[PDB]
Design a protein around this nucleic acid. Structure first.
Ligand SMILES: [K+]
Ligand SMILES: [K+]
Ligand SMILES: [K+]
Ligand SMILES: [K+]
Ligand SMILES: [K+]
Ligand SMILES: [K+]
Ligand SMILES: [K+]
Ligand SMILES: [K+]
Ligand SMILES: [K+]
Ligand SMILES: [K+]
Ligand SMILES: [K+]
Ligand SMILES: [K+]
Ligand SMILES: [K+]
Ligand SMILES: [K+]
Ligand SMILES: [K+]
Ligand SMILES: [K+]
Ligand SMILES: [K+]
Ligand SMILES: [K+]
Ligand SMILES: [K+]
Ligand SMILES: [K+]
Ligand SMILES: [K+]
Ligand SMILES: [K+]
Ligand SMILES: [K+]
Ligand SMILES: [K+]
Ligand SMILES: [K+]
Ligand SMILES: [K+]
Ligand SMILES: [K+]
Ligand SMILES: [K+]
Ligand SMILES: [K+]
Ligand SMILES: [K+]
Ligand SMILES: [K+]
Ligand SMILES: [K+]
Ligand SMILES: [K+]
Ligand SMILES: [K+]
Ligand SMILES: [K+]
Ligand SMILES: [K+]
Ligand SMILES: [K+]
Ligand SMILES: [Mg+2]
Ligand SMILES: [Mg+2]
Ligand SMILES: [Mg+2]
Ligand SMILES: [Mg+2]
Ligand SMILES: [Mg+2]
Ligand SMILES: [Mg+2]
Ligand SMILES: [Mg+2]
Ligand SMILES: [Mg+2]
Ligand SMILES: [Mg+2]
Ligand SMILES: [Mg+2]
Ligand SMILES: [Mg+2]
Ligand SMILES: [Mg+2]
Ligand SMILES: [Mg+2]
Ligand SMILES: [Mg+2]
Ligand SMILES: [Mg+2]
Ligand SMILES: [Mg+2]
Ligand SMILES: [Mg+2]
Ligand SMILES: [Mg+2]
Ligand SMILES: [Mg+2]
Ligand SMILES: [Mg+2]
Ligand SMILES: [Mg+2]
Ligand SMILES: [Mg+2]
Ligand SMILES: [Mg+2]
Ligand SMILES: [Mg+2]
Ligand SMILES: [Mg+2]
Ligand SMILES: [Mg+2]
Ligand SMILES: [Mg+2]
Ligand SMILES: [Mg+2]
Lengths: 383, 65, 141
RNA sequence: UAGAAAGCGACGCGGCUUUUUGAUUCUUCGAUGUCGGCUCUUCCUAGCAUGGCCAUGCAGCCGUGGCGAAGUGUUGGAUUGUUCACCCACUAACAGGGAACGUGAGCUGGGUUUAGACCGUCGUGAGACAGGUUAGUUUUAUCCUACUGUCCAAACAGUUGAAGGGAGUGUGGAUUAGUACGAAAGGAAACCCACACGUGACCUCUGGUGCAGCGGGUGUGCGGAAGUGCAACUGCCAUGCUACGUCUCCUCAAGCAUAGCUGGAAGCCUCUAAGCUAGAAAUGAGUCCUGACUCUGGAAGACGGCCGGGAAGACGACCCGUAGUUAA
RNA sequence: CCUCGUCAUUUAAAUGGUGACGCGCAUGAAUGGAAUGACGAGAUUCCCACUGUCCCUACAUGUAGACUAGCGAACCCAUUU
RNA sequence: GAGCCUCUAGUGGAUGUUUUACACAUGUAAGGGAAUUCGGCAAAAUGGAUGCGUAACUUCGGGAGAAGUAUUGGUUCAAUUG
RNA sequence: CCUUGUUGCUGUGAAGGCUGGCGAAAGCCAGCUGGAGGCGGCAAGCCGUAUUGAUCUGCAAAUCAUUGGCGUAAGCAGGGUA
């Protein structure tokens, strides 16, 4: 018989099976379309999640048809996330070829001198090594093997990508001695131009200001917070049963009909929740800056850094460059994230508007924070 | 930037925190937190709550008008 | 859209505040028309989902019945606008407000007010979408 | 209002369906738990709303009859054990059904249908009554298979993408405009902005919670005070977790119904017989989740345990550190 | 029985409750008839207070449960699923 | 000779681990207040003593603690049971 | 049927009695004394309404928790006898 009343499904089947992610560091798996009409540029980067705060911005957005004469301006309060982005270092390149089975890698070429931080990823246990890792490779520079290698890459390739690592030693709160390694794609120009651009930059440091600027739209890829094994009420959102029932209320009561004589994959069951890969599209950059240069607005004539009183709770003080973005972002503090240029441009009016800040909150995140600087606390109390 | 000054405690309130309570007498009043709103309801006199800026001024621990 | 008895001809934009008032709620009448207490029986604009009771915030139009008031007026169905609420609300500028007691005010099908004077304070945002209320309120916040 | 056929369609005639109730007794009486509701998933179309179109007794507004289409929706209550019925309120709309009359080792136990008892009618009586009334025990998974997650098959670092899943839906306001159209009364048609329901995340703010921490009192113990047990009560409140909080959600290609272009059959004609153009919330891809077989690289040592932690956790597994901005 | 009888009151809305009416399928006088008080873990309807019953669920405590040492069964079974 | 706390006299073992989900005994909750369900089932609310004030009906005994309201700790005094 | 055991704390305040007032009489009204009842709230006990709670390979071939009914009496009980 048909059910008595209509209702929507619980949870989305776009994310089933909901299994645990394999490792905590994401690869950018998809990149925006190349265009030979533009200069050679990079398309992505790595970042670390610091924490959250709030800001006040001015706005003037209204319906184009609204008949009001006056150029109304209005304050809006918004929550923001802070990400730390030290410069990445380039250490090699890869070329790929198109086939009936997709892209396949032809060869990889590495710089003559490599850092202790990057060699540390290649071994499993840090404190137990003979360190004979890349010691024979430098001969290939003398032999001309490098010059033969570049020829083959230049002759037979469709897509070129660089290899870059992050300078973990600059962020002590991570307790980490192995760098993270990411493969990043180059768009613009021809294969030859791409290869020459790469060759000029092996061993050097690229700042985040190469890749992104204020007001840009970007996509953020990360792994969510973990929550362990959980029941259907939390995993899929199903309703709790009648209060006087025996054998438990926090369950789906009926898990199928008599035929077919099996359970369907569409029914909710208990299991893992959290620690999955998720991508957030079209987030907007409100600000870019540095952890130890003070700043001011046109209206707030105090001069202060981004760091709140006492630092972010399990991190401390930002020291390197940073990005600020609208809304919340995947995962807890200290997790690695991958940043990408937006896959396609947005038509929505909320996305394409300007941003003008007047205040940024710098009060303590432990307890009720009631001062913006140590000077105010010293003035409120005696002496 | 401040939201204002708390009615009961005397404490200045940061932008984006605290709440206004509006009575049927037609008055609007600003409180720092739920703590001090509740003390008003229970008719605890502020001068007896010794950490308040009000109490400290009344005792003459802090220079005031 | 205008259907059934007591239809409404004067639709306005909702604000997205929290919804403290729902079917079953008894609340005071703030105007001088002669009703005293209203019992909430429906809300305009609600399409509904399974097991959920219809709810309203400031600015919304409710269907109610008169449970206290003058003899001519009792046990009849009427339309009213919600002017204040005991549940907390958040403005887009980040300010939060809370009133001591909730209340509503009676209107005609065309959106005209029934009475001539309104007791006590009224929320600013309501006076932006219902302009006639501005004229006869006690104070605006 | 003329007029068979906009819409209807007497008197007769041919079919389809199994969702009603019959008809029959093939399977089960060394037992297949029997009505309704609650909870949750999937399917059908004979299409109620939402999208594209054709006819009209289509001026406009509101409608009525038909075509391709099953993606997304179809609610809150009063009396009643009800399925059913009938009213009130909202709504874009409140269509109709199937899955052992879906679903009792998932619940509930109001109805029916053991043993107590009352009433009416029938019986000389014991007793009867698809007549009415009240009280009346809901057992067991630790096996196999399915389903949901977890490890291994697969050294370490960087990747590839076969195949499987799939997601956004609708309402209102403003403007066009008191305009076209109509004797008048009335009265339409993008882009932008606000919201609801659904989906995925997040704690800066605001609610909630009080395990760590600080305070207060009642009865009675340790000679007094101070420090405190037991019975338990009570005000505030870090970190964390959470919603009553905050952020989130479009673009191509091939083409349905239809309306057209060129054009014969058939010197004329004609959307079709070849060929071409515009075309839907539908279909197939991309952006989104899972990740088969592969591919590129470094080096005579590599890797696991043991020891200590967490941002991770049922156990494994994952992320990390071990003579250092290491721990206490 | 017909039957969710008709009219009034209680609700926004009454197959319910109370008040009336009566050719009553098939009421009725110790097979006892009718109207009250005091008293029922008896059956039924409404109002005030009160609330996680519900909207719509969230957080926390003790004891089991998961993993580990010592001890150690039963129902059931043509079985290749 | 209630419950709670102490004196005399008497008393105790299947080991380690901070330990997900679902349970079983319990706490607390914004705004709303029976909308839940056959049905307020379960829970919450009321609670001792002192005073003021107490209706219909009744077999005149009762109803009656009707209902409805106010007070209550420590200290230092008067006055002698108020 | 014969012989025995087992009533603690509290509320209400019948019959009878003493004073004072009112009345021509008969007998009416106050305050106090007295302590009746298959009479009220509880304790020890005896019982078995609800949660259709726990348990259902049980602690147990009828048990446990909270919640209930009576408790100055057609109440509960040992032994001997029919
Ligand atoms: K069903
Ligand atoms: K992809
Ligand atoms: K509190
Ligand atoms: K049988
Ligand atoms: K049954
Ligand atoms: K249609
Ligand atoms: K459908
Ligand atoms: K059962
Ligand atoms: K599996
Ligand atoms: K090897
Ligand atoms: K696919
Ligand atoms: K929070
Ligand atoms: K908190
Ligand atoms: K003790
Ligand atoms: K708090
Ligand atoms: K085309
Ligand atoms: K597909
Ligand atoms: K080798
Ligand atoms: K370890
Ligand atoms: K009726
Ligand atoms: K009635
Ligand atoms: K008779
Ligand atoms: K008779
Ligand atoms: K007789
Ligand atoms: K009884
Ligand atoms: K616990
Ligand atoms: K254990
Ligand atoms: K004693
Ligand atoms: K005692
Ligand atoms: K009810
Ligand atoms: K009912
Ligand atoms: K029950
Ligand atoms: K009399
Ligand atoms: K009474
Ligand atoms: K007595
Ligand atoms: K039971
Ligand atoms: K035992
Ligand atoms: Mg949990
Ligand atoms: Mg049960
Ligand atoms: Mg904090
Ligand atoms: Mg429901
Ligand atoms: Mg059938
Ligand atoms: Mg069986
Ligand atoms: Mg059999
Ligand atoms: Mg069976
Ligand atoms: Mg069809
Ligand atoms: Mg069935
Ligand atoms: Mg079954
Ligand atoms: Mg029953
Ligand atoms: Mg029987
Ligand atoms: Mg019984
Ligand atoms: Mg504590
Ligand atoms: Mg240190
Ligand atoms: Mg009923
Ligand atoms: Mg009657
Ligand atoms: Mg008789
Ligand atoms: Mg509450
Ligand atoms: Mg409250
Ligand atoms: Mg219901
Ligand atoms: Mg009860
Ligand atoms: Mg005695
Ligand atoms: Mg007695
Ligand atoms: Mg006892
Ligand atoms: Mg007995
Ligand atoms: Mg029973």
């Amino acid at each position: 018989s048909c059910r008595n009343y209509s209702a929507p499904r619980h949870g989305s089947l776009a994310y089933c099976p909901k299994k645990r992610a394999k490792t905590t560091k994401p690869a950018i798996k998809s990149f925006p379309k190349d265009d030979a009409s533009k200069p050679v540029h990079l398309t992505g980067y790595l970042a670390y999640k610091v924490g959250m705060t709030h800001v006040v911005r001015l706005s003037t957005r209204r319906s184009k048809t609204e008949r009001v004469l006056k150029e109304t301006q209005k304050e809006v309060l918004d929550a923001v996330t802070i990400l730390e982005v030290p410069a990445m270092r380039i250490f090699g390149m890869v070329g790929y070829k198109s086939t009936v089975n997709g892209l396949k890698a032809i060869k990889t070429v590495y710089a003559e001198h490599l850092d202790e931080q990057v060699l540390a990823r290649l071994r499993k246990r840090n404190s137990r090594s003979s360190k004979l890792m890349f010691k024979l490779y430098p001969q290939k520079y003398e032999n001309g093997d490098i010059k033969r290698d570049y020829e083959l890459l230049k002759r037979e390739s469709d897509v070129v990508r660089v290899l870059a690592h992050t300078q973990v030693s600059k962020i002590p709160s991570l307790n980490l001695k192995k760098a993270h390694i990411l493969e990043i794609q180059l768009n613009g120009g021809t294969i030859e131009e791409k290869i020459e651009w790469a060759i000029e930059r092996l061993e050097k440091e690229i700042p985040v200001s190469e890749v992104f600027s204020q007001q840009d739209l970007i996509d953020v890829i990360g792994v969510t917070k973990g929550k362990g094994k959980e029941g259907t009420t939390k995993r899929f959102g199903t309703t709790i049963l009648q209060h006087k029932s025996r054998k438990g209320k926090r369950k789906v009561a009926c898990i199928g009909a008599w035929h077919p004589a099996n359970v369907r994959r569409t029914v909710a069951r208990a299991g893992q929740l959290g620690f999955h890969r998720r991508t957030a599209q079209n987030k907007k950059i409100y600000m870019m800056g540095n952890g130890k240069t003070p700043f001011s607005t046109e209206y707030d004539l105090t001069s202060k850094t981004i760091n709140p009183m006492g630092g972010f709770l399990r991190y401390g003080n930002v020291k390197s460059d940073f990005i600020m973005v609208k809304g919340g972002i995947q995962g807890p503090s200290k997790r690695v994230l991958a940043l990408r240029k937006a896959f396609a441009p947005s038509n929505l009016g909320k996305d394409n508007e300007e941003i003008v800040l007047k205040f940024v909150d710098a009060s303590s995140k432990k307890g009720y924070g009631r001062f913006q600087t140590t000077e105010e606390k010293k003035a409120y109390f005696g002496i | 930037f401040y939201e204002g000054t708390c009615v009961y405690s005397g404490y200045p309130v940061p932008r984006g925190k605290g709440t206004y309570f509006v009575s049927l007498d037609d008055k609007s009043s600003l409180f720092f937190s739920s703590k001090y709103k509740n003390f008003s309801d229970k008719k605890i006199k502020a001068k007896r709550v010794k950490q308040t800026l009000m109490s400290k001024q009344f005792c003459g621990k802090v220079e005031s008008v | 859209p205008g259907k059934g008895k007591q239809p409404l001809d004067a639709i306005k934009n909702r604000y997205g505040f929290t919804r403290g008032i729902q079917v079953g709620t008894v609340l005071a009448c703030a105007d001088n028309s002669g009703a005293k207490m209203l019992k909430t029986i429906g809300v305009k604009g609600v399409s509904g989902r399974l097991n959920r009771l219809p709810a309203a915030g400031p600015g919304d139009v409710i269907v109610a019945s008169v449970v206290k008031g003058r003899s001519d007026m009792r046990k009849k169905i009427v339309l009213a606008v919600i002017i204040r609420q005991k549940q907390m609300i958040r403005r887009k500028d980040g300010v939060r407000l809370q009133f001591e007691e909730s209340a509503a005010v009676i209107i005609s099908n065309k959106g005209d007010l029934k009475g001539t004077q309104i007791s006590g304070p009224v929320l600013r945002e309501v006076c932006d979408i219902w302009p006639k209320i501005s004229s006869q309120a006690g104070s605006i916040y």
